[PDB]
Design a protein around this ligand. Structure first.
Ligand SMILES: [K+]
Ligand SMILES: [K+]
Ligand SMILES: [K+]
Ligand SMILES: [K+]
Ligand SMILES: [K+]
Ligand SMILES: [K+]
Ligand SMILES: [Mg+2]
Ligand SMILES: [Mg+2]
Ligand SMILES: [Mg+2]
Ligand SMILES: [Mg+2]
Ligand SMILES: [Mg+2]
Ligand SMILES: [Mg+2]
Ligand SMILES: [Mg+2]
Ligand SMILES: [Mg+2]
Ligand SMILES: [Mg+2]
Ligand SMILES: [Mg+2]
Ligand SMILES: [Mg+2]
Ligand SMILES: [Mg+2]
Ligand SMILES: [Mg+2]
Ligand SMILES: [Mg+2]
Ligand SMILES: [Mg+2]
Ligand SMILES: [Mg+2]
Ligand SMILES: [Mg+2]
Ligand SMILES: [Mg+2]
Ligand SMILES: [Mg+2]
Lengths: 135, 131
RNA sequence: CUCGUUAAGGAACUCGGCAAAAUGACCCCGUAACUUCGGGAGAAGGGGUGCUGACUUCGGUCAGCCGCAGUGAAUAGGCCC
RNA sequence: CGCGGUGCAUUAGCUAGUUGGUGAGGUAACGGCUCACCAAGGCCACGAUGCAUAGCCGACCUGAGAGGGUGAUCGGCCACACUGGGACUGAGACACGGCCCAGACUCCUACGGGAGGCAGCAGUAGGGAAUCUUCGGCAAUGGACGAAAGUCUGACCGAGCAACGCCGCGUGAGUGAAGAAGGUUUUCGGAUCGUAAAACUCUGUUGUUAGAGAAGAACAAGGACGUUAGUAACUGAACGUCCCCUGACGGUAUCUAACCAGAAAGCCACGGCUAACUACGUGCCAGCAGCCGCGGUAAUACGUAGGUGGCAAGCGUUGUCCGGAUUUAUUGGGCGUAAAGCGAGCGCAGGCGGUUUCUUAAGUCUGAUGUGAAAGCCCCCGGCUCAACCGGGGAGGGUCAUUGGAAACUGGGAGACUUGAGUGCAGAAGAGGAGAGUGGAAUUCCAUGUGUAGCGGUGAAAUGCGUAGAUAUAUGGAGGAACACCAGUGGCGAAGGCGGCUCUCUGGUCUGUAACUGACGCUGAGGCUCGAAAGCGUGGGGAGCAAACAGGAUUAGAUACCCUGGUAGUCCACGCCGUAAACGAUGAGUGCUAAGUGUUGGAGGGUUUCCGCCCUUCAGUGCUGCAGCAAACGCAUUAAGCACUCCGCCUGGGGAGUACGACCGCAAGGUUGAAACUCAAAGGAAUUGACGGGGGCCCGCACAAGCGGUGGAGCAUGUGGUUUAAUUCGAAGCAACG
RNA sequence: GCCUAAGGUGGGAUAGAUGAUUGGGGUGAAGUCGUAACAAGGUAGCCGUAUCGGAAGGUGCGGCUGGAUCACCUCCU
RNA sequence: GGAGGUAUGACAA
């Protein structure tokens, strides 16, 4: 471009965006608007717990939960690990991160936080999946 | 048209240098005369001569080669394009190739080198580097 | 039967707002969707109107006065989706 | 008051005390600050107005820097005090813990009436992913008041909670083997956990206990003296020197001594990117996963165990910012084929601009002066047992400001010149365009005769037409459309596009000429115009061709390809549409840069009886090709090379040229033009293979030419199913089945 | 008495949430229907437009080569 | 010698 062009219209950068828009918003019941807040984790209520079939190179029953967030955005997350204490209406805590198998799951569920029971008999990579030491 | 006869002069030099021609002829102006004299007395050219004709003084150049083959000039480049003109201060005077080339500057004193400018503590418009 | 008033409410009447009531003249402001760009439109919605002196450059205007009320009575669209 | 700092034009108009003036009023003060009167001005594409967003800054994080992002703690300016308004008091408010009023919200009432406003420090509820004790003292420092003691002070000093962060020390150290047991593994020999352990020697950072016990404190007042200038004179004021007393923290820091190795290490990862490997279980399930991707009976990728590696009182994970990302390229990118050159032109505004004298000094360069607070970054110092931290000093920081010079360059102004641009003279070419008419060939139809059984069509046929005279043949006539040869990577035009012939009107281009103007030019958003074919409106017309459609065929089907018919439409005039593989898939302009060859229109020259040939030169139009360019293909004086000016355009693929909005349109739909969500690819060029209902060459019981068989019967044998207690297992196109 | 906040009424503007129903879009190991494109993809393909049709797509008009094959002219080597 | 025009094939591996 010519410098005249670059003054008549400047370089307008490639607009960016997040891999987790649901975490980057909030809600005040008074004015009832999306409040933009950069929150690492959130709370939600599992509105469904089920299984899904992953993409073609893989084959499995991937455990998901559809969840109703504090900010009233409904979100599909993954239940990592082996086993869960979850049901519909079960309070849950959510963190970010894709699950490359299904597309519609941009989020993960956290273990050891709330009604989510810690994983059972997991001794390695233990902070992850949230289960206390075997003494 | 000729919106930049200085850069036309520089590019004509570059083209003749790439084909390894021996001389040049150019419709001249006083700034071209200054630049040609600087190159003459800095070692990038063998010789330069003038021609007076009614429309405009022609200036002819006689280029320089270490051998039949080797070139003294490698490439030039104008910085004040003029679409974005380059004015610089006595500290922001460029140093072409750490002193192995030369920048050509115009100042209150006149058309001079980065040597003289960075010595006198003046600056001005930069119009050409020479690798 | 033809008329006139009516407390509070106000279509609960009724097949159904039937009938009656309300609006109604003039000046000014302002006037939507839609549209065959002509209209819709007097849309809607509002305000003002009497008398007496000054004032205009002749209609506007200012001040004052009286009344519950000033097209003071009669005659003149109910409107919108 | 200058200047500066955020997004949208899918926001182009905005204002009316608004703009200015004459008066008057008003404020601490200027002024439309306010009122009247007079006038209609004023702001804006250098982005006004509107919408959204936001306290600004020093500074903080990152970065080579340019820059980006943030505005927490500390400091500065601003604004607010339940929401809105208004004043009073006062030097100072239109006042957090003041007043009045309106509103919302709550509280106490004896039910008559009152009262309140934590975004002060703590603290409660709620929201939330989540961020503190309803602590002590005014000893310090600072502030109000007071003559002073002193009173007040949730400012502030301190303490408390939180591994929230940065720094520091720990969690013992020495000796101790071809190496205890046990764990894991094993090639069953051994290997590793491993000098790690046990054992012996030492220590007490730390911890427990007991003693000693700082600074931070300066003071003020008070008791004493002394000096000054004021004194009629002493108290007294100012100044100096002694005495006097003052600590929440806290009996904490700190120091000493006694004692115990004793009470004190975990987190993540180990397929590659990435440092770090085996065993068992599991078997595309369980699960892993930042990306590539692991897992389907032998998983260094799941889970566990052992082992190792990186960090360490932390580790890991999410979320946010920067960088890498030159992935918005000023530094610092591109547009022939990958993303992208608007379809093309005419031109307002702006951007840029030939040579040159003089002038200025807006830009530019430059000296000095001031300021850029402190804290912070950085450099040198110094104190905290070092370090963090703390303090001192310095440095730097501004597209900063005033003054003072230069002026080379850009700009401003007064000129001057002709090369650029254009006018004039004379010539050249041309499907250049619009209007008008005219033509011969051919088809179709009609008429007249000849003549009579098929014509037409196909891979096959068939539908059809034809005995009522077909086809065909010969002579005319009507009607429409297109122009054989010439005709050519030839010509013109900005493009689209334009081929018969003549005439009317008209445009641009080229060559010389060197008379004339004398930089007048180029680009050109936004606008205006033109603009293939299809298509729309009105009315004509309609020969042939031909969507739709019909029928015949084909086909598994055939809403198609084939055939026979055939409507709109194709054509004319006007008005709309405004799209294209609108392509040289290459914007316009200018200049420079080997050569070769043809060719179109010219000009000049040297010959030639002219013709013609040759040399030079301009403007185009093709091919080959050097340099250079290119990812390659390819380009190369008709650039995709070197350069400069301007415009348009791109920032992965899809969603999507969609939606919303606006404009345009009779309508169809066009122009502008996203996001959500989704993938880790999409793509370009080229290479090797393979393939081809692609070509060429060749060969083979491959076909052809032939002979004899299998498939049909019966039996033998093998195979598949099926039955079976079992009918053992294997073999499955050629290449399993005597 | 002027000025005046709040308030009421009125018609508009603007931004968002929700909305029966509907439209296409994207993703999802082994569902269905054809086989449109890639070779001459078996009718060369694609671009624009119109029209048709279950669907790809087909047909007409115009354009392009980002078109394979055999047969002529012009050009260059 | 070369250029311009003149029917179907499960998913993964
Ligand atoms: K603010
Ligand atoms: K306020
Ligand atoms: K593992
Ligand atoms: K028509
Ligand atoms: K082949
Ligand atoms: K074309
Ligand atoms: Mg009544
Ligand atoms: Mg009723
Ligand atoms: Mg009635
Ligand atoms: Mg009346
Ligand atoms: Mg960088
Ligand atoms: Mg308060
Ligand atoms: Mg490795
Ligand atoms: Mg793991
Ligand atoms: Mg295994
Ligand atoms: Mg492209
Ligand atoms: Mg400072
Ligand atoms: Mg047409
Ligand atoms: Mg070539
Ligand atoms: Mg045979
Ligand atoms: Mg037999
Ligand atoms: Mg045999
Ligand atoms: Mg096909
Ligand atoms: Mg095909
Ligand atoms: Mg059809």
């Amino acid at each position: 471009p010519t410098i005249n062009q670059l003054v008549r219209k400047p370089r307008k950068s490639k607009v960016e965006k997040s891999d987790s828009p649901a975490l980057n918003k909030g809600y005040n019941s008074f004015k009832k608007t999306q409040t933009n807040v950069n929150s690492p984790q959130k709370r939600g209520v599992c509105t469904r717990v089920g299984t899904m079939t992953p993409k073609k190179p893989n084959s499995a029953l991937r455990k998901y939960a559809r969840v109703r967030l504090s900010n009233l955005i409904e979100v599909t997350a993954y239940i990592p690990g082996i086993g869960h204490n979850l049901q519909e209406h079960s309070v849950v805590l959510l963190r970010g991160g894709r699950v490359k198998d299904l597309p519609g799951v941009r989020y993960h569920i956290v273990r050891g936080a709330l009604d989510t029971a810690g994983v059972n008999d997991r001794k390695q990579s233990r902070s992850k999946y949230g289960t206390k030491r075997p003494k | 048209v000729m919106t930049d006869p200085i850069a036309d002069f520089l590019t004509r030099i570059r083209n003749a240098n790439m084909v390894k021609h021996e001389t040049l002829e150019v419709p001249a102006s006083k700034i071209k005369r200054d630049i040609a004299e600087i190159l003459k007395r800095e070692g990038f050219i063998r010789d330069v001569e003038y021609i007076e004709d009614d429309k405009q003084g022609v200036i002819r150049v006689f280029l320089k080669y270490g051998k039949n083959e080797e070139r003294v000039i490698t490439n030039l480049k104008r910085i004040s394009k003029p679409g974005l003109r380059a004015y610089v201060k006595a500290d922001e005077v460029p140093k072409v190739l750490n002193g192995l080339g030369i920048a050509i500057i115009s100042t209150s004193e006149g058309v001079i080198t980065d040597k003289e400018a960075r010595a006198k503590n003046i600056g001005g418009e930069v119009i050409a580097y020479v690798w």
